[PDB]
Design a protein around this ligand. Sequence first.
Ligand SMILES: C/C=C(/C)C(=O)O[C@H]1C(C)=C2[C@H]([C@@H]1OC(=O)CCCCCCC)[C@@](C)(OC(C)=O)C[C@H](OC(=O)CCC)[C@@]1(O)[C@H]2OC(=O)[C@@]1(C)O
Ligand SMILES: Nc1ncnc2c1ncn2[C@@H]1O[C@H](COP(=O)(O)OP(=O)(O)CP(=O)(O)O)[C@@H](O)[C@H]1O
Ligand SMILES: [K+]
Ligand SMILES: [Mg+2]
Length: 994
Amino acid sequence: MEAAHSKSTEECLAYFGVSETTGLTPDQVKRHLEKYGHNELPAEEGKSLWELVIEQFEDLLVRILLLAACISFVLAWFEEGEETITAFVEPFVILLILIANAIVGVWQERNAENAIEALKEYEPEMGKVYRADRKSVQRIKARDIVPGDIVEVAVGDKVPADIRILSIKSTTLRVDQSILTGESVSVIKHTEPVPDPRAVNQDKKNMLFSGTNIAAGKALGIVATTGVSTEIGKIRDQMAATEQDKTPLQQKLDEFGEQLSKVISLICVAVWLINIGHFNDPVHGGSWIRGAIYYFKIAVALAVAAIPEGLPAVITTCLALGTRRMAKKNAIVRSLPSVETLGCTSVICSDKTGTLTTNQMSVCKMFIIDKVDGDFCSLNEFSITGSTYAPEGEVLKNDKPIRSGQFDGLVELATICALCNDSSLDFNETKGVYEKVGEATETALTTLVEKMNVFNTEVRNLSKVERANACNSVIRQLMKKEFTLEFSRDRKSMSVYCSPAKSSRAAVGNKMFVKGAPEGVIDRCNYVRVGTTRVPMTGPVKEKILSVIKEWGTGRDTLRCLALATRDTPPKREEMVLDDSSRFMEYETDLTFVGVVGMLDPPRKEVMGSIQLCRDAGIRVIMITGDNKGTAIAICRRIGIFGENEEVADRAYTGREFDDLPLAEQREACRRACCFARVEPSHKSKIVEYLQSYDEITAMTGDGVNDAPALKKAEIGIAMGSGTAVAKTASEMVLADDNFSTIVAAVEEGRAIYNNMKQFIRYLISSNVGEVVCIFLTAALGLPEALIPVQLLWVNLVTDGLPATALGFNPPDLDIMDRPPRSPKEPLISGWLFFRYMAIGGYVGAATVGAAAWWFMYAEDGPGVTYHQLTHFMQCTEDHPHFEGLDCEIFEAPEPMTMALSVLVTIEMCNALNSLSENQSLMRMPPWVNIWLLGSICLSMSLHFLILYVDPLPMIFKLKALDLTQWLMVLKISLPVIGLDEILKFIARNYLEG
Ligand SMILES: C/C=C(/C)C(=O)O[C@H]1C(C)=C2[C@H]([C@@H]1OC(=O)CCCCCCC)[C@@](C)(OC(C)=O)C[C@H](OC(=O)CCC)[C@@]1(O)[C@H]2OC(=O)[C@@]1(C)O
Ligand SMILES: Nc1ncnc2c1ncn2[C@@H]1O[C@H](COP(=O)(O)OP(=O)(O)CP(=O)(O)O)[C@@H](O)[C@H]1O
Ligand SMILES: [K+]
Ligand SMILES: [Mg+2]
């Protein structure tokens, strides 16, 4: 039953045809189970090991790697019978890289939480029902509860389904339903229908929601909806159905592997076409097995050279270390890759209470009526010092302190505040700080009354624990609180009914004290209190009352205002029905205005500045709050979002205003808007999607289970540290200090991280560019493998990997936050910079093979056909005559390979330095800015020297230490890469566009 809140007790009973005193019949339970199913959220979306390791291998680069291991593995079964048992080292290493990969992908799963699952925490195991088999109640599995069931609940129970309350057995019934929203004050529940069929949940005063807790009471009810059709159920489905896009980096990396795969193919075709003369070779002889070996051993060298195998491990290290840096600055990032999307944030929607403000309220101004005389009006305005909940502070009239007792309106205004109050105080001794007992806005009142000793109580010597509620107690001794009328949003007020507690204080009989939103209660006033006396309410006084309330609320004071009033002649107790808020507004009429109180919920110290950072950074900030639109605009002005005298007819909106727009004007409103007041939780998701439709990158704050779908929908979901468990698991980020300024600090760090990450990505990819040219020449010129795949593996995982990591620690730019947000559709390498890495990879591929060629041809340690005929080395074991009067196994020598490899390793340290900056010279930007990177270069060189010298390792790498004269050539060959980039950099700034 969808609309159970809008129906009568009887109607719901009749809908399912069940009797409240008997329950459902076994047959009716059979039938209701097959119609509505069991009372549970769907089982989790199943994944497994066999399905998890395959996911690791449905990447494309890793697929190609896997194939490259196979060929290598067959190759390690045909090279020679005994040339090298290190034939087997190649394929077994590639597998490790895949396995290591596979392993990590799954210990990142055995740890990751699910928000759909975090909901289940709010499903209770058991429930209680009455049914027709038994007179008495039976405890059963909440799983087996059905719509139409008669259910019982009491203190401490978790609510099993969504239930229409039938009868409240106890004298009252309060419910904790903060699991939905966040605010923990329990709320009164009633039995009568709620007329509006499109009522929001806060107004469903007669419903109990699955997942909430009973704070006080015992109630019988009938089950309206179960499982996925509850309110927490309707959120599970919004959360399941919402699909998160990939981060723009994953998006780019995916596009990389897609193009890399087609490139490799072009190169194979090319290699084949250049060796199409091989078809003109004679048929008898040669060695097909040695041709096929060669076009295969070059085929795998082509794969491990193309792919930046170290890259995912480097990205993940930067993120993980950035993450821990960010936790130092109060931001707890949940998934590593969202650090990239965070820094891209173009729009921020933050809640106001608690995040833009301290949620620590106290009363600042207050006024009573001093005199009424026709049109002539005089208010009596006051100010109050002290910003905390502590009773330290004083009242002033035009800046001189006053003794509040000599104002009679003041003693009355005091007692309303103390009596019309469900909250209080208790002094904490471990912190030495006064904290609040209930609601913050009421606690401000209970604090205000402690500052105006209306009865001038000698309190100048009291113990602090007993100083907590001293002035309030004397006002509790005066009137017994017979009962109270709870706050509801139709009438936006609350009240209490009181009787005097003595026999000498027992004057004037019974009274109602009233507080609420000023429009509503002032419209219900026909009298005005001037001191002890009383006078009929008029125009001139109502003017000069709403006048001051508009000033206090829409002024640079930005104050939250309550009107306070008494009903001097309340109805007789027997003529009030207390079980039905429908009548509570009518009970609270014919009032006497006593005064108005104005409190502040202050901005946080750091918020002012973070918003200017956002302007500097091209980030739109959007406030979301509960204040009336008028004071909402005013707080925006005070925190910098708006200018003081800047027109905002079209950049603020209430929910009521937002809905009354056709869907067209709604999308457009979200492009301009910077303020939303009094929203319905559904409006957060709408706002996101509209923002998304402009390719915005949106950060959204949220607190409770009913904020989860918008949290999961925004590009960056932001939860509060003090928020629910569920909202934390639905968010990409958690604020340990609930503070907005933390968000802005996270955007800053996430921009500083990507600009570093930007460079080591560029760095590693370029090396792979260079490697592939080395390989291509090898195959196109007809050269003995200048670089074996096993070596390349070392270079990409270890030798290159260390500078790349140091590069995540580049000093941040001074102007990180003075630039607009980065377009996600921005390529890493493009236009001119593409032409530049095309030239540098061009270099490297030539220098590497030329180091092998040099050692073969023009060098001292090996004769080699200067006539270039070395080329035909595969036909040396037979064609000794044809300009080859020398040896043959020399073309598998380690020495010319280490020449190549050393030239590669040395070249890559140089390129890491050129990579400290995209376009700035090293004469403008020294290498010793990144000290951690100077340091790591020294490390890899050692490891080069390690695998060149330590007896087990050179045979493994087909390597061989080279002497002083061979290092000098290695430097000669490699050192010029610095000079090459310094020139292309010179072009970038001085002659193209920039
Ligand atoms: C990595 C290994 C190299 C060999 C390669 O294939 O990369 C190409 C390709 C993948 C693109 C290119 C490379 O294109 C070439 O170098 C032309 C082919 C040369 C023929 C070889 C025989 C002489 C990148 C590498 O070239 C430069 C010059 O660096 C830059 C960039 O890559 C990036 O943006 C990296 C993504 C973070 C991409 O153009 C990229 O594809 C596009 O989708 C981008 C946007 O990705
Ligand atoms: N304890 C109380 N007794 C009577 N009226 C109260 C009250 N607390 C708040 N109000 C009044 O109720 C009006 C409606 O505000 P509501 O109380 O529903 O929201 P809220 O202040 O908790 C919103 P938010 O989501 O921003 O924190 C306010 O304008 C205020 O004048
Ligand atoms: K999200
Ligand atoms: Mg409130």
